[PDB]
Amino acid sequence: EFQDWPIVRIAAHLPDLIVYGHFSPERPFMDYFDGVLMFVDISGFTAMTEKFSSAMYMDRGAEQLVEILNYHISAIVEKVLIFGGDILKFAGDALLALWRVERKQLKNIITVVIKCSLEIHGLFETQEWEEGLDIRVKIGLAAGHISMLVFGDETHSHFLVIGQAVDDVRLAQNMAQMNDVILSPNCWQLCDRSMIEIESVPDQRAVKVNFLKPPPNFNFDEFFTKCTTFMHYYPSGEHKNLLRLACTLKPDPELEMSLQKYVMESILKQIDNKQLQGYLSELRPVTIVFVNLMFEDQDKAEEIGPAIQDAYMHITSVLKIFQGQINKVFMFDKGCSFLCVFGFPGEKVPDELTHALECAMDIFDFCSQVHKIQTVSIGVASGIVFCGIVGHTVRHEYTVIGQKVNLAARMMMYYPGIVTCDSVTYNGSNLPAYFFKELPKKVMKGVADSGPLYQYWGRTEK
Ligand SMILES: Cn1cc(Cc2cccs2)c(-c2cc(Cl)nc(N)n2)n1
Ligand SMILES: [Cl-]
Ligand SMILES: [Cl-]
After folding, report:
1. What is the CATH number of the domain that holds 296?
2. N or C: more exposed end of the chain, with fewer CB within 10 A?
């Protein structure tokens, strides 16, 4: 069976949530369901990202990083997919996975997901990044109600999952230390407590899994097989040994037209074999523009959707003018964030810095006027970042990785309500100093040395 069609290669960059969705053209589109989420990231990774920018790697740092990273990430992806999960998105060394099911099956599927988690940790026992640098992961799990949101224009689509279960899994994963599996309180409340031995987590209602102790007659393989009854797209029969049903997609112009809107043009070029398959693995100077839109705690997903759509329509028009791209969109704790980037796949202009600032101020001014958006915050950082397609052959995404990505991310959270930029952006800009304000230096998680940070005040006093 031939399976290397363009539609199949495109679907590798998307979850089943999208590939097998059958929703309208309206934007925003919103749908609601229940499921279990897994958030996982890798330990000792940014330690490696720094090593690979070193002259040691003789101009093949990006190639070596993507290789070792995909060696480990693809093993996680295989485990998730074998256990029936849907990988929603990748970001650097992290990924979010979904087991969507009806409420009645949540209990049994949580047990499936915990077993998956423990087998993921089993991969990284007796394993190291380097001589003397261990590789481990941290897993948070949550369960409950989940809302999906799709937004975009006629040519581009983006999607998110939203709600307390999403917020819950983010929080659970941040408590997790190396080798931990942390369950949200609602997950613990819904799970088969007859079978999961947990321990308290100080000052928190979330719990840590210690052991899966099933009854004496329990057989996991038979239990799992029964659970697959509720998995619409689990590969089966003649396709028993495929990792994804998406692998079997056949040409369908209408379907491909909708799927390609989720994928960046330079990726599509590679899918069409009009660009070398290694072009996108690179250590590249870029400017990161990390936009955060904050809503109110009581805001419902059905008011949030229209506001993200309106904001997105202006964000994409500004980025088009200033020649930037949306690399990722995320949401948790009532904040929807856009990871925008200037200067990757051939999108290199000399005034990159002035255009990133002016573009940021434009996005700020417009989004501050959108009805339900309570606060806008934008962090701008410039420097060398890793770019590449991360994941497994059958499920992967283009992603950017680096200190400057993390810095822009922390700037928009620690300096809310304004536009901030780093020292590289400030000095390199073709703008005078009174357009800026030098800021207080705040200690920020995961950023050892900020360097001087500035607010982009604007051209006027007012
Ligand atoms: C790798 N990655 C990281 C994130 C942030 C989150 C991590 C835990 C909850 S959210 C996402 C994501 C994906 C989708 Cl589809 N929706 C939303 N809200 N976040 N993916
Ligand atoms: Cl098809
Ligand atoms: Cl870096």
Report:
1. 3.30.70.1230
2. C
